[PDB]
């Protein structure tokens, strides 16, 4: 199903595989590339034993090591927290969500190993609304963490596969497409634009 294959990247990821260290150093690689042809980097510390995951998008919520929140504009029960993800404020200083009268009002800033849009992005009116979705997901995520799209099989599923340009343009890398995809937040948003500016012509040519 969709949960057990963004349960099993993430583990990969973080645990098993290392993939955020193989990101890192592709990413590093590419960053002295660069310095050699003429930036502060943001990393993540070891991971830690209890990773902390945001699900937007599920009107369900679907442990040891998993800290799962989920949050839906229309929660089909009390395990999922009511919010319009676009209006919730990303704020640094706190560490756990800020409920006013029964809504998520305010979420932590740089707290999120992993982010999970469960077909957030098919509910959206428009691609303006859908690039404000990857703006919070990457306020927030940690450094090198990951936001993780859905889209069980428009014509065309809404996986931002087309996209790479404006998302490096904030600071979020494609790092896994599966027949399901993942951006990861680069080590630096210089680094992220600067690729992207190398490529603007393909990326122009895909975005508009």
């Not at 990861?184 to 690729?195: M, N, T």
């Amino acid at each position: 199903s969709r949960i057990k294959w963004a349960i099993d990247y993430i583990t990969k990821y973080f645990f098993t595989e290392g993939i955020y260290l193989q990101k890192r150093q592709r990413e590093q690689r590419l960053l002295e590339s660069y310095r050699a042809e003429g930036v502060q980097c943001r990393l993540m510390e070891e991971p830690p034993d209890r990773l902390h995951v945001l699900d937007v998008g599920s009107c369900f919520n679907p442990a040891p090591h998993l800290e799962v929140t989920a949050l839906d504009l229309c929660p089909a029960t009390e395990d999922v927290l009511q919010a319009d993800f676009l209006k919730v404020e990303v704020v640094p200083g706190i560490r756990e969500p800020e409920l006013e009268e029964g809504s998520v009002r305010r979420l932590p800033a740089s707290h999120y190993e992993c982010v999970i849009f469960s077909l957030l992005l098919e509910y959206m009116p428009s691609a303006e609304q859908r690039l404000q979705c990857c703006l919070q997901a990457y306020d927030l995520l940690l450094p090198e963490g990951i936001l993780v799209l859905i889209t069980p099989d428009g014509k065309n599923a809404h996986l931002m596969k087309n996209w790479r340009y404006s998302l490096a343009r904030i600071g979020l890398l494609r790092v896994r497409f599966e027949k399901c995809m993942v951006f990861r937040k680069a080590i630096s948003r210089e680094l992220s634009q600067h690729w992207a500016s190398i490529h603007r012509e393909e990326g122009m040519c895909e975005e508009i």
